[PDB]
Amino acid sequence: DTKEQRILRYVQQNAKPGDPQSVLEAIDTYCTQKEWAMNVGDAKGQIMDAVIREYSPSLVLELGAYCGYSAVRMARLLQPGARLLTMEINPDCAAITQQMLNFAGLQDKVTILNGASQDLIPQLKKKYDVDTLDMVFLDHWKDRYLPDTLLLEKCGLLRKGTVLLADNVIVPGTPDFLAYVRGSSSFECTHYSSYLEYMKVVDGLEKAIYQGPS
Ligand SMILES: Cc1ccc2nc(C)c(-c3ccn[nH]3)n2c1
Ligand SMILES: [K+]
């Protein structure tokens, strides 16, 4: 039994359906209980929340779903009419994330895309009717942060003000991505520190707002 399975089972047994906050808490509670290092957790969750509230995106792209914690986190704050597109390379994680969202009552707002970002990002404009993204949450594989950022620019998916929020830019680290956005005039960058338990290490998120092409 994978951890994602066990998490979903726990949520379905303890949280309240259509109550996104209770789903998030049950995930946080269980993971804590089992001492599993969380992919996001509530503290980073609070940073994601503030970014969503601050920019009120109508169309969000999430790279990496895992058990669907961040998807529930983001979808619950989206306005009616808004969409979250979530890319997940692992079919089994995709399946869990769908169930998680169904249970939270948020499935209407989310489209799960199963596959690698390098395969799926170029399909956005036409297959999923995307003009430009309002926000991108990067939480997939470290070595695809910078290439996917370049790919999103190339596909014309970013506009001035598009908010890229990247997780784990310190641990395990995305230094090349950071060097790129902090040094590019195409981005305005803010850093948010946050602590990873068990490893007991300060990690961080980078917020990088697209300014348009150079
Ligand atoms: C290694 C690697 C390459 C490409 C890619 N695209 C996505 C969405 C993911 C992923 C990571 C976690 N969940 N999904 N991914 C992982
Ligand atoms: K910059």
H/E run at residue 203: strand 201-210
How far is residue 136 from each of residues 122, 139, 159, 199, measured CA to CA in Å?
15, 9, 12, 27
Alpha carbon nearest to ligand 1 atom 1, residue:
141
Q: How far is the CA of 117 from the centre of ligand 2 (A)?
A: 24
How far is 120 from 150, CA to CA, in rounded Å?
A: 14
How far is 97 from 178, CA to CA, in rounded Å?
A: 29
How far is 86 from 197, CA to CA, in rounded Å?
A: 26
- Tell me how the structure was determined: X-ray
H/E run at residue 192: strand 187-196
Whether 100 contacts 67, CB under 8 Å: yes
How far is 205 from 183, CA to CA, in rounded Å?
A: 17
Q: How far is the CA of 209 from the centre of ligand 2 (A)?
A: 9
Q: Which structural domain, as residue segments, surrounds residue 126?
A: 1-214
How far is 113 from 55, CA to CA, in rounded Å?
A: 24
Which are the contacts of 77, defined by CB distance < 8 A and separation ≥ 6? Answer: 49, 52, 53
Find the CATH number of the domain harbouring 2. Answer: 3.40.50.150
Residues in the chain: 214
How far is 40 from 71, CA to CA, in rounded Å?
A: 11
Which are the contacts of 175, defined by CB distance < 8 A and separation ≥ 6? Answer: none
Whether 169 contacts 206, CB under 8 Å: yes
Q: Which ligand is nearest to the CA of 114?
A: 1
The number of distinct structural domains making up the chain is: 1
Whether 34 contacts 58, CB under 8 Å: no
Burial degree of 1 (CB within 10 A; 0-12, 13-18, 19+): exposed
Q: Ligand 1 pocket, 68 CB below 6 A?
A: no
Q: How far is the CA of 16 from the centre of ligand 2 (A)?
A: 43
Question: Can you tell me whether residue 173 is helix, strand or coil?
Answer: helix
Q: Which ligand is nearest to the CA of 88?
A: 1
CA dihedral 134, 72, 126, 120 (to 10 degrees): 110
DSSP track, 115-157: S-HHHHGGGHHHHS--S-EEEEEE-S-GGGHHHHHHHHHHTT-
Alpha carbon nearest to ligand 1 atom 13, residue:
64
Give the position of tokens 């503290």: 43
Whether 204 contacts 170, CB under 8 Å: yes
Looking at residue 16, what DSSP letter applies?
P
Whether 101 contacts 15, CB under 8 Å: no
Closest CA to 89 of 139, 19, 32: 139
Give the distance between the most distant pair of CA atoms in the chain.
51
What would the two tokens of residue 95 be? 């399946």
Q: Which amino acid is at 167?
A: D
List alpha helices for the chain, DSSP H: 3-14, 20-33, 41-55, 69-75, 91-104, 117-120, 124-127, 145-154, 175-183
